[PDB]
């Protein structure tokens, strides 16, 4: 089916593209998020009415993501305590929720879906690197320390 | 010996009585057939 991309979506196209896509991809991902619109002629003219100013909202969203990423890289170190026994082996875990609540406690707020933990869910104490993304193009790093309760 | 009809009025009314006939569509057709035939006694209810 034919859709119009309102944003850069991976390896499909830029802002505005007569692109042929799979129907499940349009129906379950691209249209329920703000990423694509079906390509009926009313929707094509309705997009082309404000296509010249559609780049401004994407630019300010990218600028807000860059400002949040600099904030995160200015913060750079977060501390969470948890119940660990002999050595460092945490009895529980410090997961997304705990990490997201820790950055909201440390500085300005971050959401639950921004963390991109590559190794795991932080089962051991010590120093860890936690990745963040607010946009599809931006990426940030946080040093996270887990200590005893 | 013990014959087949062992009378209980409460079981009679719960099995064949008027509200048991109205509780289902088929008992309502039973009542409709008896009314169309012109039965002086619609159910077992006294």
């Amino acid at each position: 089916m034919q859709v119009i991309l309102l944003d850069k979506v991976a390896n499909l196209g830029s802002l505005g593209d007569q692109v042929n896509v799979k129907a499940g991809y349009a129906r379950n991902f691209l249209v329920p998020q703000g990423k694509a619109v079906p390509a009926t002629k009313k929707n094509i003219e309705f997009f082309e009415a404000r296509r010249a100013e559609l780049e401004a909202k994407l630019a300010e969203v990218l600028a807000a993501a860059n400002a949040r990423a600099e904030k995160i890289n200015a913060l750079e170190t977060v501390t969470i305590a948890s119940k660990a026994g002999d050595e460092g082996k945490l009895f529980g875990s410090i997961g997304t929720r705990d990490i997201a609540d820790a950055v909201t406690a440390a500085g300005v707020e971050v959401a639950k879906s921004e963390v991109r933990l590559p190794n795991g869910v932080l089962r051991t104490t010590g120093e860890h690197e936690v990745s963040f993304q607010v946009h599809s193009e931006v990426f940030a790093k946080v040093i996270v320390n887990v200590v005893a309760e | 010996m013990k014959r087949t009809f062992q009378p209980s009025v409460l079981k009679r009314n719960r099995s064949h009585g008027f509200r048991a006939r109205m509780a289902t569509k088929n008992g309502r057709q039973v009542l409709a057939r008896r009314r169309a035939k012109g039965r002086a006694r619609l159910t077992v209810s006294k």
Binding site: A23, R27, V31, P38 | -
Partner: protein, 77 residues
């Protein structure tokens, strides 16, 4: 029941015909699936039991025109 909420496809009845042409009664059921459709207008997911043909006409006509047709028919959701 087994009714598509968009197209109104119901189970219909036919015959299972054998090689010796023995007919036995059978049903043709619609290809029905419960599905959550995102409405861009009202910021919501509506769950509809739709046929796959109903999902095709939902993709063709939009979910708003289809939901207007169900609202005109008095179909709730």
């Amino acid at each position: 029941s087994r009714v598509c909420q968009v197209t109104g496809k119901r189970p219909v009845t036919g015959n299972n015909r054998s090689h010796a042409l023995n007919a036995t009664k059978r049903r043709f059921l619609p290809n029905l699936h419960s599905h959550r459709f995102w409405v861009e207008s009202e910021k919501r997911f509506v769950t509809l039991r739709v046929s796959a043909k109903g999902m095709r006409v939902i993709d063709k006509k939009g979910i708003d025109t289809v939901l207007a047709e169900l609202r005109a028919r008095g179909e709730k959701y």
